[PDB]
């Protein structure tokens, strides 16, 4: 069996978000479930536990006033709703199945995890990137993909034909609330006069595609 969660969410501060986790009939009736979140580059924070039979719950003191966990047995689905969101709630949220084992303490055994769902909380609005050249025995060139929101952006080079020597860096979140990333490639200096280099940027959240030819 497999725990399938809903897709990524982008929310403004003060909104609420409801994440689903689809399991099975046997799984919901035989196990308790937990939600655990992981902020970017951070560790894990336990949020609470639900018994799908009758919906009894117990929440971490940090989330008690604004998280509600429910289940719908007709659809073998568990839900986690987090209210009064703020930017620090930006994280990947996981559902985890709890294998009975720790009888003395009553603690969990996180046997099986959903794939996670990303929730981004920001006051920023959707916005496609501007793409600027990073112009040039080895030469480097690239594309600066600047001022977009939310994640993600994909970058390829020459429609996928150029993969060797490519580095597309993780985005950084700027003071403005918009993201910025670079993609670079190293090539022989001798090819600069002859070989054409295009980076192909796709920002699906804003339906923005850009091809930028990068020249010396």
């Amino acid at each position: 069996v497999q725990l399938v969660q809903s897709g990524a969410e982008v929310k403004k501060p003060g909104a609420s978000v409801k994440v689903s986790c689809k399991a099975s009939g046997y799984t919901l009736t035989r196990y308790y479930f937990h939600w655990v979140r992981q902020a970017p580059g951070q560790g894990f924070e336990w949020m609470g536990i639900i018994n799908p039979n009758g919906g009894g719950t117990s929440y971490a003191q940090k989330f008690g006033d604004r998280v509600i966990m429910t289940s719908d047995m007709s659809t073998s689905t568990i839900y986690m709703e987090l209210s009064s969101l703020r930017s620090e709630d930006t994280a990947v949220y996981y559902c985890a199945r709890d294998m009975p084992y720790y009888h003395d303490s009553g603690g969990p055994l996180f046997d099986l995890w959903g794939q996670g769902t990303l929730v981004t909380v920001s006051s920023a609005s959707t916005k496609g990137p501007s793409v600027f050249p990073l112009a040039p025995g080895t030469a480097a060139l690239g594309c600066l993909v600047k001022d977009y929101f939310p994640e993600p952006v994909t970058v390829s080079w020459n429609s996928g034909a150029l993969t060797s020597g490519v580095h597309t860096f993780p985005a950084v979140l700027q003071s403005s609330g918009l993201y910025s990333l670079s993609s670079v490639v190293t090539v022989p200096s001798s090819s600069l006069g002859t070989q054409t280099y295009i980076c192909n940027v796709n920002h699906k959240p804003s339906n923005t595609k850009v091809d930028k030819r990068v020249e010396p």
Partner: protein, 213 residues
């Protein structure tokens, strides 16, 4: 709340090594300690529960030991699929808490960065801000310091850095640093320099340009 302290925070290792990582809770937790593996972009996977019991499907090379406030996870000889981050997690009392992880990365010979500097494009300047970018390509180990100077004034607070995952073929890292200035400040100053310090360099390497050449 029980604090879970893992050590070391990171470990450079080779295929075939025996690796032992440690977890110390701030309070005794009997044996109610689980270990998980997580790779980038994926959910954690259960490895060990009850301090010493192996979860079914987990290779025999994994083992765990400990009780009270001292716990270890041991991989008897590392395999290429074992480079990942490992987390301990206590099931003794609410709220249930996790360590901050031990990341295992591939050891290789030292490799100095190739360094490149990129002035802001004329396109960006027309739009009213300037980004200067410094690239450190294919180096090892991961520790590297990038320093920006503008007219020999040392900059801090106005740059951000990003690092790639260890390369799958040569096990190196790459780093991008972006210096952010107003268009007005960019045009007030002349000399823009990126100074890189790294163990693979006998002395720091500086790449520079002067605006408008």
């Amino acid at each position: 709340e029980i604090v879970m302290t893992q050590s070391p925070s990171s470990l450079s290792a080779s295929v075939g090594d025996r690796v032992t990582i440690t977890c110390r809770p701030s309070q005794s937790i009997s044996t109610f300690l689980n270990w998980y593996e997580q790779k980038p972009g994926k959910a954690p996977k259960l490895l060990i529960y009850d301090a010493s019991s192996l979860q079914s499907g987990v290779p025999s090379r994994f083992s765990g030991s400990g009780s009270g406030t001292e716990f270890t996870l041991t991989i008897s000889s590392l395999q290429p699929e074992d480079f990942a981050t490992y987390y301990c997690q206590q099931s003794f009392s609410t709220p249930y808490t996790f360590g901050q992880g031990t990341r295992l990365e591939i050891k290789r010979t030292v490799a100095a960065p190739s360094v490149f500097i990129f002035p802001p494009s004329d396109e960006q300047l027309k739009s009213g801000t300037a980004s200067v970018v410094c690239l450190l390509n294919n180096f090892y180990p991961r520790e590297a310091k990038v320093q920006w100077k503008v007219d020999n004034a040392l900059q801090s607070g106005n740059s951000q850095e990003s690092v790639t995952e260890q390369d799958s073929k040569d096990s190196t890292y790459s780093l991008s640093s972006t210096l952010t200035l107003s268009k007005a400040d960019y045009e007030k100053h002349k000399v823009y320099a990126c100074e890189v310090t790294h163990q693979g360099l006998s002395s720091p390497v500086t790449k520079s340009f002067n605006r408008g050449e």
